From a paper:
The red/far-red light receptor phytochrome B (phyB) plays essential roles in regulating various plant development processes. PhyB exists in two distinct photoreversible forms: the inactive Pr form and the active Pfr form. phyB-Pfr binds phytochrome-interacting factors (PIFs) to transduce red light signals. PhyB covalently binds the linear tetrapyrrole PΦB as a chromophore. In these structures, two parallel phyB-Pfr molecules interact with one PIF6 molecule.
In this study, we determined the cryo-EM structures of the photoactivated Arabidopsis phyB-Pfr‒PIF6 complex, the constitutively active mutant phyBY276H‒PIF6 complex, and the HKRD-truncated phyBNY276H‒PIF6 complex. We tested the interactions between PIF6β and phyBNY276H, red light-irradiated phyBN, or the HKRD region. Only the PSMs of each phyBNY276H protomer and the N-terminal region of PIF6β (PIF6N) are clearly modeled, but the PAS1 and PAS2 domains could not be modeled due to the absence of density maps. Structural alignment revealed that the structures of the full-length phyBY276H‒PIF6β complex and the phyBNY276H‒PIF6β complex are nearly identical (r.m.s.d. of 0.657 Å over 966 Cα atoms). The PΦB molecules adopt a “Z” configuration in both structures.
Residue numbers in the entry:
A (entry chain B): 11 to 32, 42 to 61
B (entry chain C): 111 to 144, 156 to 380, 393 to 565, 577 to 621
C (entry chain A): 54 to 143, 157 to 379, 392 to 565, 576 to 621
The structure:
Amino acid sequence: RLSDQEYMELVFENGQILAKGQRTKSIMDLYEAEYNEDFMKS
Amino acid sequence: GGYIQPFGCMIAVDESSFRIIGYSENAREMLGIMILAMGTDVRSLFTSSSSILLERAFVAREITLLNPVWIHSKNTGKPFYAILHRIDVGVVIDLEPARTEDPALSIAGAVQSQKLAVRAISQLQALPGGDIKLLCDTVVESVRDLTGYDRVMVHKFHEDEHGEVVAESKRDDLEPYIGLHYPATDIPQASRFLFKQNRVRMIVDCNATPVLVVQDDRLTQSMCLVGSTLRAPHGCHSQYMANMGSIASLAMAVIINGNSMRLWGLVVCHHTSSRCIPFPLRYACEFLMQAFGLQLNMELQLALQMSEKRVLRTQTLLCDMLLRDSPAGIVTQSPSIMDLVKCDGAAFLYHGKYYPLGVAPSEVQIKDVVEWLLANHADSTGLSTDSLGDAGYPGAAALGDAVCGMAVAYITKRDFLFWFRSHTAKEIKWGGQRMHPRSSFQAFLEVVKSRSQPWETAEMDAIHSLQLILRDSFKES
Amino acid sequence: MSKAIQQYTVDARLHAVFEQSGESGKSFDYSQSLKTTTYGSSVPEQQITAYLSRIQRGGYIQPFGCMIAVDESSFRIIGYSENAREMLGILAMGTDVRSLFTSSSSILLERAFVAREITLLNPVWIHSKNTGKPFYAILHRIDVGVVIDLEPARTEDPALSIAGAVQSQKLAVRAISQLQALPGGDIKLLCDTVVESVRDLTGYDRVMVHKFHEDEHGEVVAESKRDDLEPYIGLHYPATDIPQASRFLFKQNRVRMIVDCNATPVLVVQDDRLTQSMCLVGSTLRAPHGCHSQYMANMGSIASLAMAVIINGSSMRLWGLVVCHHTSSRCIPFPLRYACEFLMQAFGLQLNMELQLALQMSEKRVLRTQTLLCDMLLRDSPAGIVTQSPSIMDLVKCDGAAFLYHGKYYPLGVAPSEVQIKDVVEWLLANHADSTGLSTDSLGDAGYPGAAALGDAVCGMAVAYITKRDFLFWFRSHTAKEIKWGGGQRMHPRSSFQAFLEVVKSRSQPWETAEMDAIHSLQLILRDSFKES
Ligand SMILES: *[C@@H](C)[C@H]1/C(=C/c2[nH]c(/C=C3N=C(/C=C4\NC(=O)C(C=C)=C4C)C(C)=C\3CCC(=O)O)c(CCC(=O)O)c2C)NC(=O)[C@@H]1C
Ligand SMILES: *[C@@H](C)[C@H]1/C(=C/c2[nH]c(/C=C3N=C(/C=C4\NC(=O)C(C=C)=C4C)C(C)=C\3CCC(=O)O)c(CCC(=O)O)c2C)NC(=O)[C@@H]1C
């Protein structure tokens, strides 16, 4: 499952250096949905 | 004058004067003309910037570095993707309509074709690095997610050049094909040759009517459309697809280092209905194929080295066992001559005494084989064969399906070492005339009817090493 | 713990010293600060917290693009860079962002905003409402909303933008193909090819490959430069010249770019209701710290581009970096940066393959040598392992070897004299007669009184016990023997090199685990053989 990268942050907790953080369709279906040009006809 | 698939268009133009020399019959309808004719300047069919880009591509040395070009039709103003390549007469241009007309979305998709490939390859980087099956399964799932086809498979080729299906992902309601073996004649040699030079093949609709390609009557021979991406499929394969139930297809090559590169296999995609995917996703897949090839080559080298280490360790243990006891002790303890190579059984003949292990012939049968070997193979140090029938063993080569292949190593003149393999069909399992996968599977089990798997060079070298050590030991005795 | 975790305190202390020197109006003292600040000791947690916040929540960006932070549900602006108005041709807290761009661009931005777990419009190509200037918009998510980085794009026909992207990706593919055809088993050739390919692709003045060692310090192993520049190939520098936090960040943003180190940073204004300063970890426009900017200025490099080299070690490991330098300001477009990322992934895969093959070959060689030595021992006296062609000098990498057996001393190569070795034996028995052997990187650090007498010839020692009075010794000299670069208060590469040759002054190269395992195996074999006699 492809996904977007998530970014983390270093923090100092309890003497430790810790890193903290902040789909049912295929990629083709998303490409068809998001690259629809109908709105450009208005 | 060949044929092309109707989903695109093709124009062949002279390199020096830009004058059209050939074209598909559907060119005028697609370009919006219906002028296009012999001797016409191609640049007059496109806008000014399109002509500038075309000239730039034409004057380049590595023409494959300017592909795909984005151009616009002079009459209607629609966008096309153009792919150019060189032939003996001039330059062939494959024109394909673009389904996105907004420039902003065009640029966005061109960037996504890179971002998607990077995000997919990051998932191959994360594998442990010691398993080929896991690598193949991951690639199958990634390609299926990217393209969305109904079936995605990995095909591996053997030394015999026959094919096997090693990984597959599909719908729940389709019949599986994992484990299928088929002859080597189902994919002619021309197709394998082309899969190296042009690493993708796409068929949008096998039932679609092909389109004739007209060319200048002044040419002494028909144009070479072999490298064109719109070339129409053959009758044999088109009928095969129709019988199997596949309307659309996409095949990609797997390349490794040979000894010069080698075609290891293919990735094959099938859809129950017509399908044509947009360019960004095609290139996202084409980029992932290269990383897959790199990792596969790494895995092969590592497996080879580990196998060598294993064989050396086993040989050392066997030599120690020989030193501790008489030669018979080689075939009594848990390590034995059966672990040196992959086999179904083994046997040791020592001063007329017989020591069988696993699936091996009988003592009378062994005496018959020794008689035959001395009659026809006395002048040798040993041999190997994957079928006693082909070798010509008269004395009832029909030892059964259990004993088909034999490798023999001589010790002095009467002591012998034997390794035995049964017939190939023992190791092949699949759940499942008219050209169909079942017909191919049945035709495969007619060339391996009484044949075993071939003896590898590495296994022969291991057997030779053990033979040399044993011969030295018996020289001392 | 190890140095990876011990280095955080040292980095924080060096940062504090640099800040204090800046405040007092004095120059920064490099060598003195390194000598005073040493691994160990302790530090208040507040210093670590402040250091980390300063690094990750700086509040400044580079002045070659804009940054706008917006709320996810309302599309209302919660933060922006001070240069946003000038670049957009125009903002306020609460303004709706969709009004800053054309209507079609706002629709595309909404689509990009409403996606879940992946989006195929990132980056987006947008235009400004007032002027119609094209921008690449790059979006990422932070704990309070969405940050949009706006990078100006060249004004031209879209066909030419597509052509540029295509050309970059095709060059990357050709470079990977060239990597495919190399004959294996040679890492140096791999690096030499990659450096040239990257220089051809990007066009910077200098391209270098940096490798990190087990001790965390760095080495320059390949280089491709303009003729009139000095070479840095062969240089070693301490582990504190690249802090650990930047190394951690390199595992997320695999490409870092600095366009001009002399440019004035731009402050980021944010809504006063936010508790903390805005996180800039994922942003590409983050500005470098003063330490590194001054280092770059002293060196003479104005533009920089760094790409991480990551190998598999399930979990991933950072092997090194590819570093590019330019003598003037330089910026490259987004497609080329993604092409560079693609090529770095290919390079990492090949590198990992090569490392594993080398490990296997070494194991094979060690096993063969051990077998030959045992065969030699059985057919000869105990002294048949130091007098023949293969010897204990081949089991591991060393400068000298020695065998002490029944009062006889057999040296090979650079080894102590028969008088000094007696003293070493007395020291070992008095202090270390409670084990089967040991290994030390520096006799002086261990506490051997005669370490100075041995000098630079003998610094590191591995000893294996056979019986109460028979021993095997392997000896290594000091590191500076094998290090050659053809080239004190100012931050500069020469200061780094001089500071490196101050911690390895009386040390040899460390003993690896494979070498110790080989030594222990041969030790057990010889122990059994001699016990049987
Ligand atoms: C008829 C002459 C023989 C033959 C010829 C033929 N085959 C190809 C190309 C392919 N045929 C493939 C074979 C299979 N496809 C499958 O999925 C399975 C089993 C499940 C088989 C056996 C495949 C795959 C290829 C390559 C991919 C591709 O699409 O090219 C060709 C070339 C056709 C073309 O593309 O021009 C030809 C002439 N195929 C047969 O099965 C019979 C014995
Ligand atoms: C001052 C606090 C200490 C320090 C800090 C520091 N260093 C970096 C990043 C880098 N420094 C690099 C080191 C070198 N560059 C070279 O070419 C050579 C030798 C020839 C050295 C020693 C390099 C490279 C990096 C990483 C590349 C990059 O561009 O990031 C940073 C972070 C920089 C940033 O981007 O924020 C910091 C804070 N450097 C010192 O010299 C002292 C000990």
